[PDB]
Write a protein that binds this ligand. Structure first.
Ligand SMILES: OC[C@H]1O[C@@H](O[C@@H]2[C@@H](O)[C@H](O)O[C@H](CO)[C@H]2O)[C@H](O)[C@@H](O)[C@@H]1O
Ligand SMILES: [Cl-]
Ligand SMILES: [Cl-]
Length: 138
């Protein structure tokens, strides 16, 4: 077994979500993160050529980053309180894809097993992102 799970990072508010079904669409190719003054408000992830159903709320500005062909996320750091505040996706092309404000409890997620990358995310959401979990696999 090469799969592993990092999380949950955040608190117990909101309703659980998962992108487990989405990995069949392909590898992660892009990220959308809605952000305001204090929080990560929403999240969307592009699996192959297909975006996940948007999760989170509407009170923030949408930020979007596309990954390069064959670029994978190999480390995720961030910060949270009762809600998620910052995320940094570190790639195997040496890019640090940062979203949100530098404040709160820090976390640092890396994969357990050899040669695995970020395949999908899960977590909790409502009007904001309450929590996030990272799922690693081949
Ligand atoms: O005390 C935790 C309670 O949190 C409630 O979820 C919140 C939503 O109602 C609101 O719209 O968004 C925020 C931020 O995303 C959520 O935390 C849950 O509905 C309750 O079940 C829970 O008791
Ligand atoms: Cl950058
Ligand atoms: Cl940390």
């Amino acid at each position: 077994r090469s799969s592993s799970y990092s999380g949950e990072y955040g608190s117990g508010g909101g309703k659980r979500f998962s992108h487990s079904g989405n990995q069949l669409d392909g590898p992660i190719t892009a990220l959308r993160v809605r952000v305001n003054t204090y929080y990560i408000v929403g999240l969307q992830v592009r699996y192959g050529k297909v975006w996940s159903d948007y999760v989170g709320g509407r009170n923030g500005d949408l930020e979007e980053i596309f990954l390069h062909p064959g670029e994978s996320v190999i480390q995720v750091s961030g910060k949270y309180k009762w809600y998620l505040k910052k995320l940094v996706f570190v790639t195997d092309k040496g890019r640090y894809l940062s979203f949100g404000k530098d404040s709160g409890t820090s976390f640092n997620a890396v994969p357990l097993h050899p040669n695995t990358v970020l395949r999908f995310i899960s977590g909790r959401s409502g009007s904001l992102i309450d929590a996030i979990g990272l799922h690693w696999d081949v």
